[PDB]
């Protein structure tokens, strides 16, 4: 349909930078910036901190818009109209959530005669969400009123924080089509750990009882009310669609997976050039976390990657830890030269680094300095040998002075303690779920161990004394990115991995893994290993993961490169250009249901 119309994207994460929803709408703006053109807007909360960074204020193009802001400006509502500085040119409608006094009390009671949902005063963002909810309905209401012969409106609502303002637009009966896109189910988060087998018992869960118990009923109601208030209910994931079918009680009309704007290069192999450059910087790290214990070959070594928020059960570290313990067995009982260095890049509270890790990094530069001094001494003696006209002796090249330097360097390198499992020093080391499991499974980064676990208790940075490499470079360095999960509504950690050339082990319970099962037919062949976690048990899932990990371990140099080239081809699948189609289809579907008079069925 080509009809000229104005739509609004309503989210709390618009010009806030709080959650992952911000990152969704960051690159969504480009693809949605031509489908509806300049007519599309983004309704968001106003923060003075967010304005200095992201928002550049501008006047209204259309005279009807000028009055919508001015009429709203009267009556105590303040809008700072501006353009988002992010790529795409998104015109943002920042409503001040600070202006609580005019409508918080009156519209909260107005909310109760309409939706019959009450707001506790204790919960902070609860009172802030409803305010933002009425403010949206005001702007939409004025836009429909003051624009004579207003085209069919679409109100695109993201998260529970906007989910209240969904029902208000429907309650006024304002001519507006409505979309609710839940990026994560609210009650699903607490149900994931609190209730055993959440995915197995998704149908059984008493839907009102559980929310009341987690003192989160008011939030649950606002999101659930939003589903019955959108002609189109939308989930990011097909696994989240199953969640919503038995919890939110609304089947998602369309599943619109989140996407990334892939940073496409000039050479289609530049990712693999950035592989070797970043692998070397990881090689500088593991040639230093281990000094005097470097018996393993680092040219036959692999790097496994796992990242995200520090959630042991949700980000599925428990599955991956017991799997490396069995991968320890399979690469040791079998005569294998293959060593695997798994990196756990999950941020946690940490007072400072570890003396042994810092000493090892300093020793690595020391054995680089003592290998630069005698290298120059070799070089100078060679240059006066090449100039003289004689090839080097190769035995006298290094004097007794040089041999004593190198003999002492080796003597300082020697350590008896096994290289550390965690790079930094923790406040709660014994209470740490990852470190407790490591000492239990029996991987102390020993010489006998074919898998060495190197947890980095904080995010990677380029400005870091140890491991000076940023996250986007570090992913590209690692050979494989293993992401077992139980509650990843949309994998963003495994999603960004597949955007890069690195193959990622996703799961059936993850939003990314369900997407890869649906779109492409070939799982392991294209690179993305998918773990069955819905129809299996915790032990069974670990056993499948071992066979997946050992498959990558038994792979040759050349076969690894082919698979990494195949994973590059799947970047087009996660790009906003391809995955924006689904959102567009949601919009076209919304217009037709709410207003079939001039909108086609569009089957």
């Amino acid at each position: 349909d080509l009809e000229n119309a104005v739509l609004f994207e309503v989210a709390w994460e618009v010009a806030n930078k709080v959650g992952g929803i911000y990152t969704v709408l960051q690159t969504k703006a480009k693809v949605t910036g031509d489908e509806w053109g300049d007519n599309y807007f983004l309704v968001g909360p106003y923060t003075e901190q967010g304005v200095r960074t992201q928002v550049e204020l501008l006047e209204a193009p259309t005279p009807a818009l000028k009055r919508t802001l001015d009429s709203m400006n009267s009556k105590g509502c303040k809008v700072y109209f501006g353009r988002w500085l992010i790529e795409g040119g998104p015109l943002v409608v920042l409503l001040d959530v600070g202006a609580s006094a005019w409508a918080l009390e009156r519209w909260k009671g107005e909310l109760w005669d309409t939706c019959n949902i009450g707001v506790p005063w204790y919960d902070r963002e609860a009172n802030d969400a409803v305010l933002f909810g009425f403010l949206t309905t005001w702007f939409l209401g004025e836009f429909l009123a003051q624009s004579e012969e207003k085209p069919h409106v679409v109100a695109h609502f993201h998260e529970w924080l906007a989910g209240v303002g969904l029902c208000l637009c429907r309650a006024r009966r304002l001519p507006v089509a409505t979309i609710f896109t839940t990026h994560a189910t609210l009650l699903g988060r607490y149900l994931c750990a609190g209730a055993v087998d959440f995915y197995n018992n998704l149908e059984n869960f008493n839907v009102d009882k559980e929310a009341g118990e987690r003192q989160i009923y008011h939030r649950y109601c606002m999101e659930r009310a939003a589903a019955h208030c959108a002609h189109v209910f939308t989930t990011v994931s097909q696994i989240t669609a199953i969640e919503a079918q038995h919890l939110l009680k609304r089947k998602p009309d369309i599943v619109t997976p989140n996407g990334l704007n892939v940073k496409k290069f000039s050479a289609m192999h530049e990712f693999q050039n950035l592989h070797a450059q970043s692998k070397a910087r990881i090689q500088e790290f593991v040639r230093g976390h281990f000094y005097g214990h470097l018996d393993f070959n680092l040219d036959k070594t692999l790097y496994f990657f796992i990242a995200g928020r520090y959630e042991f059960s949700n980000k599925g570290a428990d599955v991956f830890l017991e799997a490396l313990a069995r991968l320890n067995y399979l690469l040791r009982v079998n005569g294998s030269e293959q060593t695997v260095v798994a990196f756990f890049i999950m941020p946690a509270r940490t007072n400072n680094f570890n003396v042994e890790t810092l000493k090892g990094q300093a020793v690595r530069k020391q054995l680089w300095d003592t290998a630069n001094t005698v290298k120059e001494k070799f070089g100078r003696k060679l240059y006066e040998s090449l100039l003289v006209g004689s090839l080097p002796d190769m035995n006298k090249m290094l004097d007794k002075e040089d041999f004593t330097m190198m003999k002492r360097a080796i003597f300082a390198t020697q350590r008896q303690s096994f290289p550390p499992v965690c790079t930094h020093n923790m406040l709660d080391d014994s209470s740490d779920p990852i470190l407790t499991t490591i000492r239990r499974i029996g991987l102390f980064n020993s010489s006998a161990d074919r898998v060495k676990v190197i947890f980095h208790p904080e995010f990677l940075s380029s400005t870091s004394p140890l491991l000076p490499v940023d996250y986007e470079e570090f992913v590209r360095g690692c050979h494989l990115g293993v992401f077992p999960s139980y509650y990843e509504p949309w994998g963003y950690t495994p999603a960004e991995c597949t955007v890069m050339g690195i193959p990622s082990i996703s799961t059936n319970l993850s939003g990314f893994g369900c997407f890869m099962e649906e779109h492409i037919a070939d799982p392991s062949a294209y690179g993305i290993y998918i773990l069955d976690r819905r129809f299996r048990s915790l032990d069974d899932s670990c056993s499948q993961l071992t066979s997946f990990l050992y498959s990558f371990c038994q792979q040759s140099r050349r076969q690894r490169i082919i698979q990494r080239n195949r994973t590059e081809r799947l970047s087009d699948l996660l790009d906003w250009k391809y995955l924006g189609r689904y959102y567009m289809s949601a919009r076209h579907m919304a217009l037709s249901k709410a207003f079939p008079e001039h909108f086609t069925y569009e089957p």
Binding site: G118, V119, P120, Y217, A225, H228
Partner: protein, 33 residues
């Protein structure tokens, strides 16, 4: 009746009680989809 709004405050809302969502779903149904 205005008692239920106060009950909502302080999270005294009843999941299966007066504040039960089933009533809310019918209330949304008054504004038919």
């Amino acid at each position: 009746s205005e008692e239920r709004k106060e009950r909502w405050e302080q999270g005294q809302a009843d999941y299966m009680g007066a504040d039960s969502f089933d009533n809310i779903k019918r209330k949304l149904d008054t504004y038919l989809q």
